[PDB]
């Protein structure tokens, strides 16, 4: 149900859990008039118990703002400390391709007043700021929100729906003991994970949970839970359940990687290309990664991960992305493609020349000459 809030018109859709996420995604793409999704990034951890370095958070936010103009992404943070500051900075920079923030929450103070239009909430309890310029609300236990978020993130990572497709990234910041089950709801969801180190405790210890391969260790799991901020003790049954859940997590470990940012787009690209490699060795998701790189112009990672790999290249995918990169004024790429197998002795036919001449910014003097001539 479409709900309105006027408190930049920050508006939302109130769609409960256990409801078709494909319909929600399509009505969001059609209603908000939001440009075609290229990539999407999600922020899952919202635990204000651990505060990453303010300088670290500001640097990461600045890097994300820089990458937003080139790539074009969606923020899917959940509606404090360093997380709230990073979100506010990202929103303030988005207010000035374009990136949008999307908050997810179930059925918040003044809930009855909002469920009934100038919204008044002058308080000093789920406060929402101007960060959610376009939001989503759910009115379904936390299992409803978990399944809803997971299935939405799965659908936004659909196929072509020109092989058009987008990447999803879930970011944990020192997580939560139930965010671990939420991560179990995503390991089989065919979506990659990226974890930081200087964010907090649970992040730093997850950096070694799956990093150090041990068959079974519930005792060591509880020792880690009690070493990293022992705010509350746990029994053996819950720790054993979480250990079995870790065993399920480690079934597809390639989708997760750690990084200490206290010591940018490069790690996102590396994680995503590892995902496309471990998923399978095909030219198609390779083409996905290629297109992303060309949108980013990370020639180093492009040559190393995609082409330097043992995959054999050919004319078709290299051809499509060559037409994509030629017009895009990135010559280094064109070189990388022609020495990799692009045969412009037979690629470029008169048709492609007409198509290249048609793709000029009408503010170019060549276009003025062509217009006057015709």
mmCIF file of C-alpha atoms in Angstrom, residues 63-204:
data_model
loop_
_atom_site.group_PDB
_atom_site.id
_atom_site.type_symbol
_atom_site.label_atom_id
_atom_site.label_comp_id
_atom_site.label_asym_id
_atom_site.label_seq_id
_atom_site.Cartn_x
_atom_site.Cartn_y
_atom_site.Cartn_z
ATOM 1 C CA UNK A 63 35.025 7.200 -1.951
ATOM 2 C CA UNK A 64 31.438 6.008 -2.324
ATOM 3 C CA UNK A 65 30.341 9.503 -3.387
ATOM 4 C CA UNK A 66 33.147 9.578 -5.955
ATOM 5 C CA UNK A 67 32.180 6.157 -7.330
ATOM 6 C CA UNK A 68 28.494 7.156 -7.436
ATOM 7 C CA UNK A 69 29.053 9.608 -10.296
ATOM 8 C CA UNK A 70 30.905 7.053 -12.427
ATOM 9 C CA UNK A 71 28.999 3.835 -11.707
ATOM 10 C CA UNK A 72 25.578 4.806 -10.378
ATOM 11 C CA UNK A 73 24.316 2.758 -7.452
ATOM 12 C CA UNK A 74 21.553 2.275 -4.887
ATOM 13 C CA UNK A 75 22.055 2.528 -1.129
ATOM 14 C CA UNK A 76 20.063 -0.088 0.778
ATOM 15 C CA UNK A 77 21.071 0.787 4.332
ATOM 16 C CA UNK A 78 18.708 -0.139 7.147
ATOM 17 C CA UNK A 79 16.687 2.681 8.683
ATOM 18 C CA UNK A 80 24.276 4.690 14.701
ATOM 19 C CA UNK A 81 27.659 6.104 15.666
ATOM 20 C CA UNK A 82 29.773 5.930 12.518
ATOM 21 C CA UNK A 83 27.015 4.286 10.463
ATOM 22 C CA UNK A 84 24.586 7.177 10.972
ATOM 23 C CA UNK A 85 27.328 9.685 10.138
ATOM 24 C CA UNK A 86 28.312 7.809 6.969
ATOM 25 C CA UNK A 87 24.675 7.595 5.894
ATOM 26 C CA UNK A 88 24.064 11.287 6.550
ATOM 27 C CA UNK A 89 27.185 12.211 4.575
ATOM 28 C CA UNK A 90 26.183 9.969 1.658
ATOM 29 C CA UNK A 91 22.704 11.514 1.650
ATOM 30 C CA UNK A 92 24.008 15.092 1.859
ATOM 31 C CA UNK A 93 26.328 14.410 -1.076
ATOM 32 C CA UNK A 94 23.556 12.714 -3.070
ATOM 33 C CA UNK A 95 21.419 15.825 -2.524
ATOM 34 C CA UNK A 96 24.162 17.835 -4.274
ATOM 35 C CA UNK A 97 24.401 8.995 -12.647
ATOM 36 C CA UNK A 98 22.782 9.541 -9.246
ATOM 37 C CA UNK A 99 22.654 7.318 -6.158
ATOM 38 C CA UNK A 100 19.528 6.741 -4.056
ATOM 39 C CA UNK A 101 19.180 5.497 -0.486
ATOM 40 C CA UNK A 102 16.556 2.913 0.498
ATOM 41 C CA UNK A 103 15.773 2.083 4.127
ATOM 42 C CA UNK A 104 14.121 -1.152 5.262
ATOM 43 C CA UNK A 105 12.137 -1.577 8.477
ATOM 44 C CA UNK A 106 9.103 -3.492 9.708
ATOM 45 C CA UNK A 107 6.112 -2.374 11.754
ATOM 46 C CA UNK A 108 8.940 3.215 15.439
ATOM 47 C CA UNK A 109 7.543 5.889 17.743
ATOM 48 C CA UNK A 110 4.357 7.675 16.651
ATOM 49 C CA UNK A 111 3.457 4.571 14.644
ATOM 50 C CA UNK A 112 -0.287 5.151 15.040
ATOM 51 C CA UNK A 113 0.119 8.816 14.087
ATOM 52 C CA UNK A 114 2.008 7.800 10.937
ATOM 53 C CA UNK A 115 -0.403 4.989 10.005
ATOM 54 C CA UNK A 116 -3.269 7.501 9.826
ATOM 55 C CA UNK A 117 -0.563 15.063 5.551
ATOM 56 C CA UNK A 118 2.203 16.978 7.348
ATOM 57 C CA UNK A 119 4.053 14.471 9.534
ATOM 58 C CA UNK A 120 5.078 15.959 12.889
ATOM 59 C CA UNK A 121 7.632 14.103 15.017
ATOM 60 C CA UNK A 122 9.599 16.739 16.997
ATOM 61 C CA UNK A 123 11.344 14.360 19.389
ATOM 62 C CA UNK A 124 14.833 14.634 20.860
ATOM 63 C CA UNK A 125 11.712 5.150 18.732
ATOM 64 C CA UNK A 126 12.898 4.992 15.104
ATOM 65 C CA UNK A 127 13.829 8.522 13.997
ATOM 66 C CA UNK A 128 14.193 9.050 10.252
ATOM 67 C CA UNK A 129 16.123 12.002 8.828
ATOM 68 C CA UNK A 130 16.344 13.502 5.335
ATOM 69 C CA UNK A 131 18.605 10.600 4.353
ATOM 70 C CA UNK A 132 15.735 8.472 2.993
ATOM 71 C CA UNK A 133 14.687 10.623 0.051
ATOM 72 C CA UNK A 134 12.876 7.520 -1.259
ATOM 73 C CA UNK A 135 12.124 4.803 1.275
ATOM 74 C CA UNK A 136 10.338 1.472 1.771
ATOM 75 C CA UNK A 137 8.277 0.399 4.783
ATOM 76 C CA UNK A 138 7.088 -3.104 5.688
ATOM 77 C CA UNK A 139 4.079 -4.034 7.844
ATOM 78 C CA UNK A 140 4.287 -7.833 8.266
ATOM 79 C CA UNK A 141 8.990 -11.465 14.204
ATOM 80 C CA UNK A 142 12.147 -10.301 12.447
ATOM 81 C CA UNK A 143 11.915 -13.358 10.170
ATOM 82 C CA UNK A 144 9.483 -11.442 7.967
ATOM 83 C CA UNK A 145 11.921 -8.576 7.433
ATOM 84 C CA UNK A 146 14.808 -11.012 6.950
ATOM 85 C CA UNK A 147 13.021 -12.986 4.230
ATOM 86 C CA UNK A 148 11.641 -9.828 2.607
ATOM 87 C CA UNK A 149 15.043 -8.116 2.416
ATOM 88 C CA UNK A 150 16.790 -11.275 1.213
ATOM 89 C CA UNK A 151 14.258 -11.950 -1.543
ATOM 90 C CA UNK A 152 14.255 -8.305 -2.662
ATOM 91 C CA UNK A 153 18.055 -8.314 -2.892
ATOM 92 C CA UNK A 154 17.780 -11.575 -4.829
ATOM 93 C CA UNK A 155 15.276 -10.139 -7.306
ATOM 94 C CA UNK A 156 17.220 -6.919 -7.913
ATOM 95 C CA UNK A 157 20.080 -9.269 -8.900
ATOM 96 C CA UNK A 158 17.977 -10.808 -11.680
ATOM 97 C CA UNK A 159 19.109 -11.751 -15.185
ATOM 98 C CA UNK A 160 19.198 -9.475 -18.254
ATOM 99 C CA UNK A 161 15.468 -8.725 -17.848
ATOM 100 C CA UNK A 162 22.169 -6.848 -24.680
ATOM 101 C CA UNK A 163 22.791 -8.922 -21.544
ATOM 102 C CA UNK A 164 21.721 -6.364 -18.927
ATOM 103 C CA UNK A 165 22.373 -7.352 -15.266
ATOM 104 C CA UNK A 166 23.442 -5.727 -11.880
ATOM 105 C CA UNK A 167 25.688 -6.542 -8.795
ATOM 106 C CA UNK A 168 24.551 -6.628 -5.166
ATOM 107 C CA UNK A 169 26.821 -5.914 -2.204
ATOM 108 C CA UNK A 170 25.976 -6.476 1.462
ATOM 109 C CA UNK A 171 28.204 -4.690 3.983
ATOM 110 C CA UNK A 172 28.514 -5.872 7.580
ATOM 111 C CA UNK A 173 29.922 -3.523 10.216
ATOM 112 C CA UNK A 174 30.530 -5.636 13.363
ATOM 113 C CA UNK A 175 27.194 -7.312 12.569
ATOM 114 C CA UNK A 176 24.910 -8.758 15.235
ATOM 115 C CA UNK A 177 24.233 -12.237 16.652
ATOM 116 C CA UNK A 178 20.964 -12.314 14.673
ATOM 117 C CA UNK A 179 22.506 -10.565 11.680
ATOM 118 C CA UNK A 180 24.481 -13.826 11.457
ATOM 119 C CA UNK A 181 21.236 -15.707 10.765
ATOM 120 C CA UNK A 182 20.325 -12.901 8.368
ATOM 121 C CA UNK A 183 23.649 -13.674 6.654
ATOM 122 C CA UNK A 184 22.720 -17.362 6.527
ATOM 123 C CA UNK A 185 19.606 -16.164 4.726
ATOM 124 C CA UNK A 186 21.991 -14.620 2.153
ATOM 125 C CA UNK A 187 24.856 -17.108 1.696
ATOM 126 C CA UNK A 188 22.595 -19.364 -0.380
ATOM 127 C CA UNK A 189 21.006 -16.250 -1.917
ATOM 128 C CA UNK A 190 23.756 -16.012 -4.590
ATOM 129 C CA UNK A 191 24.947 -12.598 -3.427
ATOM 130 C CA UNK A 192 28.451 -11.604 -2.292
ATOM 131 C CA UNK A 193 29.495 -10.275 1.103
ATOM 132 C CA UNK A 194 32.215 -7.766 2.008
ATOM 133 C CA UNK A 195 33.432 -7.277 5.579
ATOM 134 C CA UNK A 196 35.560 -4.559 7.185
ATOM 135 C CA UNK A 197 38.094 -4.841 10.006
ATOM 136 C CA UNK A 198 38.257 -1.478 11.786
ATOM 137 C CA UNK A 199 34.466 -1.376 12.105
ATOM 138 C CA UNK A 200 34.076 -3.298 15.348
ATOM 139 C CA UNK A 201 34.385 -6.573 17.199
ATOM 140 C CA UNK A 202 32.173 -9.088 15.418
ATOM 141 C CA UNK A 203 33.602 -7.919 12.091
ATOM 142 C CA UNK A 204 37.182 -8.444 13.265
#
